[PDB]
Amino acid sequence: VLENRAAQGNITAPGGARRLTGDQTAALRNSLSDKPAKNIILLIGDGMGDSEITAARNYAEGAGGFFKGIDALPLTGQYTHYALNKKTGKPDYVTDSAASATAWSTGVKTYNGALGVDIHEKDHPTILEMAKAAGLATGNVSTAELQGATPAALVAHVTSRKCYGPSKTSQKCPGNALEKGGKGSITEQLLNARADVTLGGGAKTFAETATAGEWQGKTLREEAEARGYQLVSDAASLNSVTEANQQKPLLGLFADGNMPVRWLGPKATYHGNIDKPAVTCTPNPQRNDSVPTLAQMTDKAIELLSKNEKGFFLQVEGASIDKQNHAANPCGQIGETVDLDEAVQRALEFAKKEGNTLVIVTADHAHASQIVAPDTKAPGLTQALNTKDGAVMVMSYGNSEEDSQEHTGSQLRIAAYGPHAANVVGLTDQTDLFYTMKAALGLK
Amino acid sequence: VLENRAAQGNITAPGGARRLTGDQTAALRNSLSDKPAKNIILLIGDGMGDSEITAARNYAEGAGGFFKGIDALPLTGQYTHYALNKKTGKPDYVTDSAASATAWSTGVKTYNGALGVDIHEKDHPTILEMAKAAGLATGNVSTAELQGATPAALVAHVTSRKCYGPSKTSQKCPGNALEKGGKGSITEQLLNARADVTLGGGAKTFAETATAGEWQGKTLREEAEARGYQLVSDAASLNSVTEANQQKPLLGLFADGNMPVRWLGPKATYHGNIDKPAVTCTPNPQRNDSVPTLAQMTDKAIELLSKNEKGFFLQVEGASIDKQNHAANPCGQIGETVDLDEAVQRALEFAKKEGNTLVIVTADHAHASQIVAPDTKAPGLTQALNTKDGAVMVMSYGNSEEDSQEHTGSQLRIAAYGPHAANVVGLTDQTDLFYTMKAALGLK
Numbered sequence: 001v002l003e004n005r006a007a008q009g010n011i012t013a014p015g016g017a018r019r020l021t022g023d024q025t026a027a028l029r030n031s032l033s034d035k036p037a038k039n040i041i042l043l044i045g046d047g048m049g050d051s052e053i054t055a056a057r058n059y060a061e062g063a064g065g066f067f068k069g070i071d072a073l074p075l076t077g078q079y080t081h082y083a084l085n086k087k088t089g090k091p092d093y094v095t096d097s098a099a100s101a102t103a104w105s106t107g108v109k110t111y112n113g114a115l116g117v118d119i120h121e122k123d124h125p126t127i128l129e130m131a132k133a134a135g136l137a138t139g140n141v142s143t144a145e146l147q148g149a150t151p152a153a154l155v156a157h158v159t160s161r162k163c164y165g166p167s168k169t170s171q172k173c174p175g176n177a178l179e180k181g182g183k184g185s186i187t188e189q190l191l192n193a194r195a196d197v198t199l200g201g202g203a204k205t206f207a208e209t210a211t212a213g214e215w216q217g218k219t220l221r222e223e224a225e226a227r228g229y230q231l232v233s234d235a236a237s238l239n240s241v242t243e244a245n246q247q248k249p250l251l252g253l254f255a256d257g258n259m260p261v262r263w264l265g266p267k268a269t270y271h272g273n274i275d276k277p278a279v280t281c282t283p284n285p286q287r288n289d290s291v292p293t294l295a296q297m298t299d300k301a302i303e304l305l306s307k308n309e310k311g312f313f314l315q316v317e318g319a320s321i322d323k324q325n326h327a328a329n330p331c332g333q334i335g336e337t338v339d340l341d342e343a344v345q346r347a348l349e350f351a352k353k354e355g356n357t358l359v360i361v362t363a364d365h366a367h368a369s370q371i372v373a374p375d376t377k378a379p380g381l382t383q384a385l386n387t388k389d390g391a392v393m394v395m396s397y398g399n400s401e402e403d404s405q406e407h408t409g410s411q412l413r414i415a416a417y418g419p420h421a422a423n424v425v426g427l428t429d430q431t432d433l434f435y436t437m438k439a440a441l442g443l444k
Numbered sequence: 445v446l447e448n449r450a451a452q453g454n455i456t457a458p459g460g461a462r463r464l465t466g467d468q469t470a471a472l473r474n475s476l477s478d479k480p481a482k483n484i485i486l487l488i489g490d491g492m493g494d495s496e497i498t499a500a501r502n503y504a505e506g507a508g509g510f511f512k513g514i515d516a517l518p519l520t521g522q523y524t525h526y527a528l529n530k531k532t533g534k535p536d537y538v539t540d541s542a543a544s545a546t547a548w549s550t551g552v553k554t555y556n557g558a559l560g561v562d563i564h565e566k567d568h569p570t571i572l573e574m575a576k577a578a579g580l581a582t583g584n585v586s587t588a589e590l591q592g593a594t595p596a597a598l599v600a601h602v603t604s605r606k607c608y609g610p611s612k613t614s615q616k617c618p619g620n621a622l623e624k625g626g627k628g629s630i631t632e633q634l635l636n637a638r639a640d641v642t643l644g645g646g647a648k649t650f651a652e653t654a655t656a657g658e659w660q661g662k663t664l665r666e667e668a669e670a671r672g673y674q675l676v677s678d679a680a681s682l683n684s685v686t687e688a689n690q691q692k693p694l695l696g697l698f699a700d701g702n703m704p705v706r707w708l709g710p711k712a713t714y715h716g717n718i719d720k721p722a723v724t725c726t727p728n729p730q731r732n733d734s735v736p737t738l739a740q741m742t743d744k745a746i747e748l749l750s751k752n753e754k755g756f757f758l759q760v761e762g763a764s765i766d767k768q769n770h771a772a773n774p775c776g777q778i779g780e781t782v783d784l785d786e787a788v789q790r791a792l793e794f795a796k797k798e799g800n801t802l803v804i805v806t807a808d809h810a811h812a813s814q815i816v817a818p819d820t821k822a823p824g825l826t827q828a829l830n831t832k833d834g835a836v837m838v839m840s841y842g843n844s845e846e847d848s849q850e851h852t853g854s855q856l857r858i859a860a861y862g863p864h865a866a867n868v869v870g871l872t873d874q875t876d877l878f879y880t881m882k883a884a885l886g887l888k
């Protein structure tokens with residue numbers, strides 16, 4: 001259960017590359033607790049499998065380095081995230097963001113594209129709903145559109161993840177359409193869920209007007225304001241928020257769509273590791289100092305949420321790891337993994353002081369990127385990068401001849417710290433997480 | 445710390461896909477022991493990363509299934525296996541078989557191709573050599589040529605893994621070349637190391653004659669006999685062996701090159717998941733019934749080795765997982781993963797019963813195979829398979845245009861059971877494995 005896992009010294013010498021400073025038995029034994037958790041923070045790196053973690057550590061911290069956030073959770077395991085074929089109910093080996101998020105939030109498998117509904121299109125309550133009912137405070141933060149699959153899975157039960165607002169719902173999720181007597185689009189269901197703290201992008205869908213119900217005619221933003229939501233749109237206004245509760249829940253919309261990525265780098269190309277020079281990522285000029293960082297949103301959320309005596313449940317998502325992986329952009333992808341590590345550090349720092357918080361870091365599924373030899377002549381897209389060690393690392397995306405690289409179905413790392421964190425050890429299924437969180441918090 | 449990790453029931457229903465029957469905390473806590481291990485069995489799946497484990501499980505046991513051997517080890521973690529660039533001394537992100545094996549059996553990082561020597565081309569003692577010095581019984585078994593990087597790393601100190609016998613050594617490893625002061629070729633050093641049990645392939649190099657020393661002029665096979673080794677070449681004679689020790693060391697050579705693979709299936713092709721029907725693996729008709737299986741050799745070895753009162757150290761290798769991954773042959777690859785699982789089961793059974801045996805299952809490095817969506821249009825080699833679920837799973841190899849798919853650098857799974865197994869948890873380095881084993885046996 002050590003906190004420092006960096007190489008001991010000279011990696012070229014006997015024992016210089018070791019990460020362990022001694023025997024873990026006693027320490028590891030001491031970190032095993034079945035006492036109930038008072039709080040839970042689930043950090044999700046979208047599409048951040050072991051490959052993505054390795055590539056970003058190698059680049060930002062060096063091969064023998066270690067992420068003070070992502071690599072510091074003591075209890076580790078691997079878990080499966082296969083989805084279901086809607087027709088046959090047989091496993092679909094490669095899941096999408098929707099079905100995977102639904103699994104840990106509701107504890108039941110589903111088909112690719114569904115949010116909060118099972119194979120029968122039947123709704124099941126999510127962990128955030130159950131927590132909110134027990135009286136715990138709830139948060140939902142992400143760097144993607146708040147209507148994106150991952151954050152949406154905690155507050156919406158819809159049949160197609162594309163049903164963002166009234167427009168898409170009427171024609172893609174007729175049965176959820178508010179007019180048809182349904183629960184409504186993702187956005188409207190998010191407004192109904194009323195989590196104490198909700199922060200992310202996706203401001204554009206709030207410009208749509210409800211077709212039915214009490215706030216018919218008004219845009220979703222107006223409905224938000226009318227219902228008591230405090231709205232903030234930048235780092236500054238977010239910083240000034242001093243309270244977030246059921247009487248005045250917080251809703252931050254920092255981008256029309258997804259929030260900008262931190263690093264800028266060119267897209268990987270065919271024979272790019274041979275024909276193009278090694279790259280060194282630089283900061284993204286399109287990102288303003290007004291758009292909050294994940295670490296800032298996480299920090300603010302934790303402070304506002306920790307005021308609730310009963311406890312809180314918070315989910316944080318580094319959304320664009322997946323997105324930049326689809327786009328075959330190593331810098332964008334690595335910058336976002338680093339961005340999430342800072343968020344995990346904020347969470348771990350709170351967890352350690354408080355002493356009753358279960359922190360979990362994992363991904364919804366694996367992705368395309370592979371770390372390959374400098375001289376690889378690959379069929380897909382590749383790029384050479386200048387890492388922190390002062391050495392070149394080549395990354396490869398070779399599973400799609402299309403504009404978008406794809407998810408992969410490999411089991412991946414799940415790590416945790418705190419009460420009940422032992423239930424993450426060994427082989428488990430993504431659905432076990434739901435039950436692990438429910439039992440730690442003592443939910444019924 | 446449970447033994448059954450299969451999905452509980454109906455994966456389409458709430459909680460039907462769970463692998464956990466309850467809370468692991470107490471069980472896990474109980475499986476944490478710092479008592480010294482009397483024996484160690486290290487099973488290595490060459491190139492068996494998390495993706496490889498997942499594909500094989502999907503195919504052979506179904507997505508919700510579980511490997512009775514590979515998935516039954518309770519303590520899990522992820523470890524790094526980067527090598528060193530020979531010139532700069534800086535990390536080389538994608539290791540080879542030789543450099544990786546050298547790290548766990550020696551405790552020092554090295555460059556690609558080196559066997560048992562650091563970057564300064566200096567020899568370091570291996571855990572097998574140290575075990576044998578403490579009076580423990582030693583075993584080395586593998587399905588590849590005994591001269592291959594994985595088994596050789598335990599008995600040879602050579603500057604290039606290509607120095608199989610006298611010929612290649614003279615030309616590629618002149619400094620190790622027997623006929624000028626070196627300890628000899630891989631085969632000559634293996635013959636000098638004299639482990640109690642050595643089983644595998646590579647009988648072809650034993651046909652070479654030493655160029656100097658006492659047995660100059662005789663084939664290496666003749667030298668083996670002159671030195672007291674019992675030579676067995678098929679299952680029946682292997683099964684007939686009664687004892688193996690320093691007076692009568694067992695040397696089993698079951699093939700000229702590598703042992704034949706268990707299953708047969710076609711090679712993945714360009715758009716193979718689209719232009720060709722799904723495939724169903726079949727037993728390899730060429731595999732002679734007289735050639736032992738990895739589990740049979742593992743089983744026989746444990747039997748002979750456990751006769752030493754002091755204990756034993758045993759390394760077992762499912763070598764062709766890697767070779768078939770290079771060749772882009774899913775059936776070949778999965779068959780060898782299944783093969784290794786049976787070996788693991790044999791190991792776990794002895795371990796559970798004896799109660800002072802540390803079992804570790806891991807891989808030397810990650811590989812190329814990826815599990816992708818059935819409709820994937822990939823730039824590399826794909827193939828569709830009919831899984832145990834009656835569902836189609838697609839595999840992809842897209843990191844090389846050469847005739848050999850490549851290793852990848854992602855951190856991968858390491859799992860253990862027994863005394864000191866807690867040291868495998870969290871993030872560690874491949875070199876930490878050396879120290880964990882050295883400490884487990886008290887082999888300082």
Ligand SMILES: [Mg+2]
Pocket residue numbers: 046097144148149150151317319
């Ligand atoms: Mg997402």
Ligand SMILES: [Mg+2]
Pocket residue numbers: 490541588592593594595761763
């Ligand atoms: Mg090998």
Ligand SMILES: [Zn+2]
Pocket residue numbers: 046047096097098322364365
């Ligand atoms: Zn995703």
Ligand SMILES: [Zn+2]
Pocket residue numbers: 047097322323326407
């Ligand atoms: Zn995606």
Ligand SMILES: [Zn+2]
Pocket residue numbers: 490491540541542766808809
């Ligand atoms: Zn290997």
Ligand SMILES: [Zn+2]
Pocket residue numbers: 491541766767770851
């Ligand atoms: Zn290989």
